[PDB]
Structure 1
Amino acid sequence: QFGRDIADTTDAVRDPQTLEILDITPCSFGGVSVITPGTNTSNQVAVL
């Protein structure tokens, strides 16, 4: 009925009605950083 990964995490699943297998991928995420030349000079910022 489903597949699993090395960490025993689900990667695929058979649809309950249509016996077909759908791939699963975690939604994309990441950290956030802020760049500043110093408030002593300006107030512009850029993010990454």
Structure 2
Amino acid sequence: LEILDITPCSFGGVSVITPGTNTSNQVAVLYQGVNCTEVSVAIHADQLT
């Protein structure tokens, strides 16, 4: 008999930054509109889709 909220799981967006593959192969990733101290613990739990 207590009150509990309901929230989105982590719904956001993934954008990938990259130079031309004719130049290099390194990549840096974005995580749209999410505090990524939350994904840093998430990769530890490997719960990232």
Superposition TM-score, scaled by structure 1 size? 0.50
State TM-score, norm by structure 2. Answer: 0.49
Report the structure, 1 or 2, having the larger helix content. 2
